[PDB]
Amino acid sequence: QTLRNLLSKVSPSFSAELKQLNQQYEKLFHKWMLQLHLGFNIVLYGLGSKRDLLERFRTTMLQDSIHVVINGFFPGISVKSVLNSITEEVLDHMGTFRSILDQLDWIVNKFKEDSSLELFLLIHNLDSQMLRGEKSQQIIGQLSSLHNIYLIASIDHLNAPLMWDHAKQSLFNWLWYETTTYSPYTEETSYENSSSLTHVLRSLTPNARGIFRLLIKYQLDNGLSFQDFYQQCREAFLVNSDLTLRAQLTEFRDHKLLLIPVDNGTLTDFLEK
């Protein structure tokens, strides 16, 4: 999958229609801002990567106000991290919190006491694996229930409507907009995690390399019993005592290398290489 890094040389097709499509999409920003500012939260749904449109909207209209961007497609994001970021910067508070619910209570009380605070949220790929928790969406909806917070979200998964319940629907107060941009999902697939054997075996002792080669050969022929494997290793004179063979087996185990959990085709290609 390393070849992916070199695959970016392919040129796009029919880019003129995409240009007109983006120009048509650009004109809805004022209406979206008006709908946000009256107490509505907006979801964007449609085919194609819509990150570019959101970034354009931010850099065009949100350069004069406080705004927080969370690109949830990163698999390391959690709601507690968002809460900590809000507390540390929006309110500039450093004190730790005993529980998530207590942090939510503090934030709600602070925002209710201070009516001069306005915050904008820009969430990318709200359907992330880490944000699908019921408590996560409950927390986000409770946050969005305030009249001093504006929410723009994006949907890219098919089963998104199952996330929201009737009470959650009432809390979120959603409006929908269809914006299909046809953009490739380069960045959003970049962080996602869908050679090693050669590098490991390069610096290992040649006896271990031969033993592993024999093990691969037997595995491709048809798991070995310990006794038969020891006898065959004896026959090749790569082992002088069973303690040494078990030491080599433990060395292989330490690298997570009896069955080898490696695909047959990869082993066949590696043997000749």
């Binding site: 390391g76 590098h199 390069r202 610096s203 303690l243 690298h255």
Partner: protein, 337 residues
């Protein structure tokens, strides 16, 4: 007598003034550092002297070049991975922001940070390593970071994202194990006032420290004999009477594994077989104690399942070696018959 003492002293594990047979790696490191003074990852097997050679070359660069600050840190001295953040700051003078602001300064001497045994800096999310590797590629960065590791998969398991972004790939250098000729050259360099030991060390592990220990032990045995090939092989074979009840127990267990063919035998059946054999030759706490004692010698292995009956027993020695360890065939025949 002083000759033996001097030979033992020279062959110690202390870092020497010169490390021969590693001139290629040392030259590569020197060229890299001189290019980056006017991100490196060393990976190697234990006993390759990576720490020693890096310390020697860093001392040489300190002697020859000026205008840089070099900071050593050992990861084992830190109980927590996150504790790497203060330990670095204490060596230069929210804390990570202070480190970044001190590192991105427009004017400032170059900083060469080396963290020995990088593999100990693992995290539940690998965040610390990611930040450390992304530091040298920020704006106005003056960082040359060197990471020493024994694990070969740190650049593979831990850093897929650095492979995703081409600009953040460090330069990797691997230390091959010492060959027989290299070991012989090092040994003759130590004694300016052999082949068999070097061959065995290279074939087993290639660890120069192991060869030094072997020759030290050989010198110790030679000097002990005087005060009162053969020595080297003797020591290496050394490193590389049983109670009668224990003999009866192990013979009974061998009979059981031959008879019922199972790999592991329950303690109750083993005790029953032991009692039957004792009745044949007219000879449970004692049995369990003997099993534990046998496990102490390393003859038998016990999978302990928190109960007397659930503790399972297995062998560790080939049958032929077991038979030849016995010096009497009369007992063997009597137990077999």
């Amino acid at each position: 007598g002083t000759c033996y003492q001097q030979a033992k002293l020279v062959l110690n594990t202390a870092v020497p003034d010169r490390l021969p047979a590693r001139e290629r790696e040392m030259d590569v490191i020197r060229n890299f550092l001189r290019e980056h003074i006017c991100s490196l990852y060393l990976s190697g097997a234990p006993g390759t002297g990576k720490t020693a050679c890096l310390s020697r070359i860093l001392q040489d660069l300190k002697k020859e070049l000026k205008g840089f600050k070099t900071i050593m840190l050992n990861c084992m001295s830190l109980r927590t991975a996150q504790a790497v953040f203060p330990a670095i700051a204490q060596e230069i003078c929210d804390m990570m922001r202070k480190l970044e602001k001190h590192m991105t300064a427009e004017k400032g001497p170059m900083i060469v940070l080396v963290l020995d045994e990088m593999d100990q800096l693992d995290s539940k999310g690998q965040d610390v390593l990611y930040t450390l590797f992304e530091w040298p590629w920020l704006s106005n960065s003056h960082l040359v970071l060197i990471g020493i590791a024994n694990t070969l998969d740190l650049t593979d398991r831990i850093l897929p994202r650095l492979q995703a972004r081409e600009k953040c790939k460090p330069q990797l250098l691997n230390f091959p194990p010492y060959t027989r000729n290299q070991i012989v050259t090092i040994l003759q360099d130590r004694l300016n006032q052999v082949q068999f030991c070097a061959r065995k060390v290279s074939a087993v592990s290639g660890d120069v420290r192991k060869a030094l220990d072997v020759c030290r032990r050989a010198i110790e045995i030679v000097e002990s004999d005087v005060k009162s090939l053969i020595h080297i092989s003797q020591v290496i074979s050394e490193v590389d009477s049983f109670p009668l009840q224990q003999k009866i127990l192990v013979c009974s267990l061998m009979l059981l594994i031959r008879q019922l063919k199972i790999k592991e035998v329950t303690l109750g059946k083993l005790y029953e077989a032991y009692s039957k054999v004792c009745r044949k030759q007219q000879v449970q706490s004692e049995c369990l104690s003997l099993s534990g004692l046998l496990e102490a010698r390393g003859i038998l292995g016990l999978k302990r399942n928190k109960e007397t009956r659930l503790t399972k027993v297995f062998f560790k020695i080939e049958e032929k070696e077991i038979e030849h360890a016995l010096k009497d065939k009369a007992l063997i025949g009597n137990i077999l018959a």
